[PDB]
């Protein structure tokens, strides 16, 4: 219970901060099955193939189905990781103004190249008729395209989604991160190894959650575990009798003649129709509740890596810095970093300043009092500012404001 | 006088190989942690039921038990299966017996076949006309109760004999003690190790722990 | 332009394999069908059959019985089957009430003694008896599935010989049980060689099937039959003849998708054999499967028709079909330092162009109209 | 992105009405040559496979249509959003409104659908620059109010 | 739109209950009075509709 200590002059601002790199997980993709509906609900058999055309176009808008699902999990692969115009790669030398990035680029020591953070993700995720069709982009490719993704973010900033890329350090791409979350970027420079060690060691922690906990990665896995739960189902649904003498269709075949045979089979047939049916409807559901996580990937791919977010918790709690996609089996994570503040003061504050008969109020911050003096500061930093001309704007007289207090302005002309 | 029969009289319960699996089956089994009574051979052998099929157990250094009678009345009313063994052969046979009423081993047969430091155990049950016989033989250290950890009993003979059975008797020697303990219908839960044999069982019925492990279809429940 | 499924491959079956029980004793049908005396219904007896080859034509082409009534297989089937036990059942009844012995059907018979089971399998083979037991002969006589039963409740029949289901009849029930067990009861099938490491047409006491045998490193305990895997689909079975345990794999299948340009560009296509190796079907081998008619090009480029697994396919120099791994994008190392800073002395405006669906047809089906349509016999 | 959303559509439709040929296990597909042949204790026996059979074929195509329209409506809700941030607005979210810096929208109708001509500001022809983090001057830092 | 969601719920449960009194080709709609009518040969016929 936070009673916060509200009163009509009473500001808190935060002289410190703290840099979180976050973790978001999302699904992107899903097993692109497909089963054969005629060797899964027949299998190697005339004598029920010819009772099967009987239902007719079924089987081939089921096999149209899964495959309308097999050809848009690569749309969704292709939709999140292909934002990238080029493949750009990194520079030899790793001067990002003290930032360690090491971690979450590529290792060339690696079979696959693939970062040190994405190969703790790639550990933590885990034939009648059924098939697993390969992904048109191999992971490698993934590991390819998030590390243009990566190495474009470190070099070039969001100018790699705009246009081309244009170089800049990393040490000032960050104070334009910081100019863009209203922190002046003098707090970045005079701040840049605190910052850079606290990203550095928030990149850390994400080390030792990814190997310490295996739920971490619950938001993928629970993904694998449905795609192979419904398999597992219409697999077990082979082996029920839907009130025929048996479940084996040879048993039948091999048992009875065509008048007696064929009331047996109809019954398997609608049986493992009605079972095939229940699993494509269950795979378009969730077909659509992978493409509604891969559109918001591929969302937070355009507006938190290519870019930086206004939008406030939607790149990670806190004021959003920049992310960086790392891949995951069927699925993407974004480490997003944020500007939290951290160490708040409580300050006596006032909405406007009357000098001269005049209002003042602040071009950009808030008036705040360390009990004795009146200073400006920026909003989100105690930054004191000696209150000047240049920082406050005039309007009006002291009359028409509520809660405005008498001080000097210093005009820096004087 | 009783004992606790901790995970005993778990057997493989069809002619099927299974590996790195959990196979959830219903059939007769004995309960887990079950009260089974525990006769002494000396001062005296009584006649049991036979309410489902029976897990019985022998603990023995010199096999002085040789021997089981079962039927409805033992007295020639009627067929009754007598199984002897002199550990040289198995002796199996069905007649209209008059059986003494104190029954031992000396120092209209529809029906017949031949084939402490030790525990030997055995399933015995009926289903549809076949009577079957599950076995298994474990060195343990032991006399005073039932081992405290699961071996499973694997098939020994199924006799197609179409008898009825409602009671039975052990018999031994004539020149030590036995368990009963009565099967049940309960589904369980059968693990099968990576060379196929039943290392780990959950009685779907014991208490709701066993209950969701069965339901889950997994030993681990998170 | 594209890849289409056009079909289904599967390897076919080279050849037959039947491996049946070593035994040579015919069942004793004769003391079944030939028995002195016949039981009364109330009292009717059964016998066991096991460990021989049951000749089913021996009875089914004998033109003495007057049905051969068969309920949970046909009776020219029976010389394919294996069974584990065959359970005959013999006694005598009146012609009026041989319709009883039904799985289903009721009268002063069946729903007293003989009952047939709900889900009787097995033949009910029945004839008249009027020139051997008819005398009138009041012996025959009668009083759960399957039970055995032992004023007055018992009453008995009136045949002469001058009585026609008036006449006595007589009837064997051939119950056969199919359970998962050594089958020692199969027809005369004569067993063949056994073949391994090919697709194969197999039956193992009576396990129909068809698949590639290869020998098992599995250890099957002594009173195992086959084997099952993480499904209940059988990924291995024991041979009767010799105790080896084979291993079942599926013959090699998958779809078969024609990688083609447009017919507007050319008639030339590829064919791509999904998930296998190409001994099973100017060809290659890629994750996706066995591709044919496309040449493997050292090159990549961008992706024309996706293959998967990273392959894709195009039309290119006179000109083939190509296939290739699919390029990313030019490989752009930025030309970072920690002082270096590129600006843009200049700008393009362009209109870019997005294309959204927004609404679908507003169709509506009278269900009625349709499944039924001007029809109130269907309505 | 529209002409394949008139072809499932139309598709679905011909499916539909294909499934009206088909027997069911029927004795004939059309019902009046079943009950212009049959009386009532043999014609219903035929007429429920051919009610099981389209009542089946009637609730995959609506179920088909009802995920479809969910996938239609989430496009409308995106055209929506496009509409009031791309048209009715200029948008700093990055590469929503179109690749490069927004500039503004024109919306165009199309059958079933809507166009969005995205303005978009490319930036175009770089030169490479040594640049500073801040100035030292008068023993002061400073660094750029913008730029 | 709560109202709607509210009624939508409810409608498809009302739709789910109202199923449970059609024939759909049985004799009856109620279980019992088909089990206390019928045979298990007969009874399972009806109920399996």
């Not at chain 2, 046979?93 to 029954?103: H, L, S």
């Not at chain 3, 049980?177 to 697709?199: D, F, I, R």
């Not at chain 3, 996706?306 to 083939?320: F, V």
Request: charge should be neutral; hydrophobic fraction near 35%; charged fraction near 15%.
């Amino acid at each position: 219970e936070n009673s916060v200590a509200y009163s009509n002059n009473s500001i808190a601002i935060p002289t410190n901060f703290t840099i979180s790199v976050t973790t978001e997980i999302l699904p992107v993709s899903m097993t692109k099955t497909s089963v054969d509906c005629t060797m899964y609900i027949c299998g190697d058999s005339t004598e029920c193939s010819n009772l099967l055309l009987q239902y007719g176009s079924f089987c081939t808008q089921l096999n149209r189905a899964l495959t309308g699902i097999a050809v848009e999990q690569d749309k969704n692969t292709q939709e999140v990781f292909a934002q990238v115009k080029q493949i750009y790669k990194t520079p030899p030398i790793k001067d990002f103004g003290g930032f360690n990035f090491s971690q979450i680029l590529p290792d060339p020591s690696k079979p696959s190249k693939r970062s040190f953070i994405e190969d703790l993700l790639f550990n933590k995720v885990t034939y009648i008729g059924l098939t697993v069709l390969p992904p048109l982009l191999t992971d490698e490719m993934i590991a390819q395209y998030t590390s243009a993704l990566l190495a474009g973010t470190i070099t070039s900033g969001w100018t790699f989604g705009a246009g081309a890329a244009l170089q800049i350090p990393f040490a000032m791409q960050m104070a334009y991160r910081f100019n863009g979350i209203g922190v002046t970027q003098n707090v970045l420079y005079e701040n840049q190894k605190l910052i850079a060690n606290q990203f550095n060691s928030a990149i850390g922690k994400i080390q030792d959650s990814l190997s310490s906990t295996a739920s971490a990665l619950g938001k993928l896995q629970d993904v694998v575990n449905q795609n192979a739960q419904a398999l597992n189902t219409l697999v077990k649904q082979l082996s029920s009798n839907f009130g025929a003498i048996s479940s084996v269709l040879n048993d039948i075949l091999s048992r009875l003649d065509p008048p007696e045979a064929e009331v047996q089979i109809d019954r398997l047939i609608t049986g493992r129709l009605q079972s095939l049916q229940t699993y494509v409807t269950q795979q378009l559901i969730r077909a659509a509740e992978i493409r509604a996580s891969a559109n918001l990937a591929a969302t937070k791919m355009s507006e938190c890596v290519l870019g930086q977010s206004k939008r406030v918790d939607f790149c990670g709690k806190g004021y959003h810095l920049m992310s960086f996609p790392q891949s995951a089996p069927h699925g993407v994570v974004f480490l997003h970093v944020t500007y939290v503040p951290a160490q708040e003061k409580n300050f006596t504050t006032a909405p406007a300043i009357c000098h001269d008969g005049k209002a003042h109020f602040p071009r950009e911050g808030v008036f705040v009092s360390n009990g004795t003096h009146w200073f400006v500061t920026q909003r989100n930093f105690y930054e004191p500012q000696i209150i000047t001309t240049d920082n406050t704007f005039v309007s009006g007289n002291c009359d028409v404001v509520i809660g405005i207090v008498n001080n000097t302005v210093y005009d820096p002309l004087q | 006088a009783y004992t606790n029969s901790f995970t005993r009289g778990v057997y493989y319960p069809d002619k099927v190989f299974r590996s790195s699996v959990l196979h959830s089956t219903q059939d007769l089994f004995l309960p887990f942690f079950s009260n089974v009574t525990w006769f002494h051979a000396i001062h005296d052998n009584p006649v049991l039921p036979f309410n489902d099929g029976v897990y019985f157990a022998s603990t023995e250094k010199s096999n002085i038990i040789r021997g089981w009678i079962f039927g409805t009345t033992l007295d020639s009313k009627t067929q009754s299966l007598l199984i002897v063994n002199n550990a040289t052969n198995v002796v199996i046979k069905v007649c209209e017996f008059q059986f003494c009423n104190d029954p031992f081993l000396g120092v209209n047969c529809t029906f017949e076949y031949v084939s402490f430091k030790n525990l030997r155990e055995f399933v015995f049950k009926n289903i549809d006309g076949y009577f079957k016989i599950y076995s298994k033989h474990t060195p343990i250290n032991l006399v005073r109760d039932l081992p405290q950890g699961f071996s499973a009993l694997e098939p020994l003979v199924d006799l197609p004999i179409g008898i009825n059975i409602t009671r039975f008797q052990t018999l031994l020697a004539l020149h030590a003690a036995y368990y009963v303990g009565y099967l049940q219908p309960r589904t369980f839960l059968l693990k099968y190790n990576e060379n196929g044999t039943i290392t780990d069982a959950v009685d779907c019925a014991l208490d709701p722990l066993s209950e969701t492990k069965c339901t889950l279809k997994s030993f681990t429940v998170e | 332009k594209g890849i289409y499924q056009t079909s289904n491959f599967r390897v076919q079956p080279t050849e037959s394999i039947v491996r049946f029980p070593n035994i040579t004793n015919l069942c004793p049908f004769g003391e079944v069908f030939n028995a002195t005396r016949f039981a009364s219904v109330y009292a009717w007896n059964r016998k066991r059959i096991s460990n021989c080859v049951a000749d089913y034509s021996v009875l089914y082409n004998s033109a003495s019985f007057s049905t051969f009534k068969c309920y949970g297989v046909s009776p020219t089937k029976l010389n394919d089957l294996c069974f584990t036990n065959v359970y005959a059942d013999s006694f005598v009844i009146r012609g009026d009430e041989v319709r009883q012995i039904a799985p289903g059907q009721t009268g002063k018979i069946a729903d007293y003694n003989y009952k047939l089971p709900d889900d009787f399998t097995g033949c009910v083979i029945a004839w008249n008896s009027n020139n051997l037991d008819s005398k009138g002969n009041y012996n025959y006589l009668y009083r759960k599935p399957f039970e055995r039963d032992i004023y007055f409740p018992l009453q008995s029949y009136g045949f002469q010989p001058t009585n026609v289901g008036y006449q006595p009849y007589r009837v064997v029930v051939l119950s056969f049980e199919l359970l998962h067990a050594p089958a020692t009861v199969c027809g005369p099938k004569k067993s063949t060689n056994l073949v391994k490491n090919k697709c194969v047409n197999f039956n193992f006491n009576g396990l129909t099937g068809t698949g590639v045998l290869t020998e098992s490193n599995k250890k099957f305990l002594p009173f195992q039959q086959f084997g099952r895997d993480i499904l209940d689909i059988t990924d291995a079975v024991r041979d009767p003849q010799t105790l080896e345990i084979l291993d079942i794999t599926p013959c090699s299948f998958g779809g078969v998708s024609v990688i083609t340009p447009g017919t507007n560009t050319s008639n030339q296509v590829a064919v791509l054999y999904q998930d296998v190796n190409c001994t099973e079907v100017n060809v290659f081998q890629t994750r996706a499967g066995c591709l044919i008619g496309a040449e493997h090009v050292n090159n990549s480029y961008e992706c024309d028709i996706p293959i998967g697994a990273g392959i894709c396919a195009s039309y290119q120099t006179s000109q083939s079909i190509i296939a290739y791994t699919m390029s990313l994008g030019a490989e752009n190392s930025v030309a970072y330092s920690n002082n270096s800073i590129a600006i843009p002395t200049n700008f393009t405006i362009s209109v870019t162009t997005e294309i959204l669906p927004v609404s679908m047809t507003k169709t509506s089906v009278d269900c009625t109209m349709y499944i039924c349509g001007d029809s109130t016999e269907c309505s």
